[PDB]
Scaffold this active site. Structure first.
Site, PDB file in Angstrom:
ATOM      1  N   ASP A  23       0.616  -1.047  -0.098  1.00  7.42           N
ATOM      2  CA  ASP A  23      -0.211   0.086   0.147  1.00  7.42           C
ATOM      3  C   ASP A  23       0.486   1.103  -0.233  1.00  7.42           C
ATOM      4  O   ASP A  23       0.691   2.660  -0.304  1.00  7.42           O
ATOM      5  CB  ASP A  23      -0.542  -0.136   1.768  1.00  7.42           C
ATOM      6  CG  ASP A  23      -1.924  -0.915   1.598  1.00  7.42           C
ATOM      7  OD1 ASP A  23      -2.425  -1.211  -0.751  1.00  7.42           O
ATOM      8  OD2 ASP A  23      -2.563  -1.499   1.550  1.00  7.42           O
ATOM      9  N   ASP A  39      -4.613   7.831   0.849  1.00  6.28           N
ATOM     10  CA  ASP A  39      -3.604   7.897  -0.042  1.00  6.28           C
ATOM     11  C   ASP A  39      -2.140   8.009  -0.732  1.00  6.28           C
ATOM     12  O   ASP A  39      -1.386   8.749   0.536  1.00  6.28           O
ATOM     13  CB  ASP A  39      -4.631   8.829  -0.897  1.00  6.28           C
ATOM     14  CG  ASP A  39      -3.233   9.247  -2.443  1.00  6.28           C
ATOM     15  OD1 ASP A  39      -2.815   8.577  -3.158  1.00  6.28           O
ATOM     16  OD2 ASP A  39      -4.755   9.639  -3.474  1.00  6.28           O
TER      17      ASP A  39
HETATM   18 CA   LIG Z   1      -3.299  -2.274  -2.006  1.00  6.63          CA
END
Ligand SMILES: [Ca+2]
Length: 320
Positions: A288, A303
């Site tokens: 991520d 984000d």
């Molecule tokens: Ca991801």
């Protein structure tokens, strides 16, 4: 376009484990991140290193990054670079900052295993179940072949066993002996060091942040578990759109049960502390942090492209 990310020195993105600048020449490691920073005024170069190697040594990723930094200076005319390393890339960035402190203005680490990975200890312990060493040998060959076929340049300098040993908690402490930094706290403290360092007459700005989506959980009868705080439980579409979401939950659970604490699936919070810790509260798994896979993240994950964009502005304001 604008001037939001225009830094005094060019930004070098340094990938970590399994990585390259572009997987199979198709998938960017830093997905859409280079384009976003350039769209806000940043000069961004992306290093292509061995996906599987140690950081020290003549064939290690550190010398590769030292040589790549020089090609960036010769192409931009600039004097220094802003090294931003994810995962093992932060360990590779510390190497360049220690052996050529004049070429580096700052070191930022994203989910970097400065103290090693409990999942690397787990993997090494599983391979020890075959005392013949043949399981490790055949598995390393297939992992090295994976790095050859996914490297944008078919980089054959792939050492999976050196890469695995490098990320163990015991060897990473030896790496911190060989390349100490004022941005690191004392070994075993779960505390960061100083925000800056002065090495060889150069002042380096040290930064770090970590993802801690995988949290330890309660349990009667007394054995811990894990939860993924980045996702809507059970039904989050990232579980289906991004195979790494559940994969990093399982690896992170293995880390929790070895005493790691909160982590991102492969690097714990304590192992990721370096320099100025900007945040360890991101609901992110390990990839991520690099806007992977293909931007898919849990509905609770922040984000990562804007976070990296803000830091480029932070580097711009800091004077580098
Ligand atoms: Ca991801």
């Amino acid at each position: 376009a604008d001037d939001y990310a225009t830094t005094r020195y060019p930004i070098v993105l340094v990938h970590g484990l399994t990585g390259t600048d572009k997987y199979a020449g198709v998938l960017e490691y830093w997905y859409g991140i280079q384009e976003d920073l350039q769209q806000h005024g940043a000069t961004v170069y992306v290093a292509n290193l061995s996906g599987f190697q140690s950081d020290d040594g003549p064939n290690g990723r550190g010398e590769q990054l030292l040589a790549y930094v020089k090609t960036v200076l010769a192409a931009t005319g600039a004097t220094k670079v802003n090294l931003v390393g994810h995962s093992q890339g932060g360990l590779t960035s510390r190497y360049v900052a220690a052996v050529a402190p004049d070429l580096v203005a700052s070191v930022t680490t994203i989910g970097t295993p400065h103290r090693g990975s409990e999942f690397a200890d787990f993997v090494q312990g599983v391979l020890a179940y075959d005392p013949t060493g043949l399981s490790s040998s055949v598995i390393a060959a297939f992992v090295n072949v994976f790095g050859i076929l996914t490297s944008s340049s078919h980089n054959t300098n792939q050492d999976a066993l050196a890469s695995l040993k490098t990320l163990t908690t015991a060897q990473a402490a030896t790496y911190n002996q060989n390349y100490p930094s004022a941005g690191l706290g004392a070994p075993g403290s779960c505390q960061t060091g100083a925000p800056t360092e002065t090495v060889g007459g150069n002042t380096h700005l040290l930064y770090s942040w970590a993802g801690t989506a995988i949290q330890p959980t309660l349990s009667v009868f007394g054995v811990t578990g894990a939860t993924d705080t980045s996702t809507i439980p059970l039904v989050d579409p990232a579980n289906a759109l991004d195979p790494s979401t559940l994969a990093l939950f399982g690896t992170g659970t293995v880390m929790i049960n070895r005493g790691s604490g909160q982590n991102d699936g492969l690097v714990s919070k304590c192992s990721a502390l370096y320099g100025q810790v900007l945040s360890t509260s991101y609901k992110w798994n390990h990839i991520d942090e690099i806007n992977q896979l293909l931007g898919v993240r849990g509905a609770f994950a922040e984000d990562p492209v804007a976070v990296i964009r803000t830091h480029a502005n932070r580097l711009k304001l800091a004077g580098v």
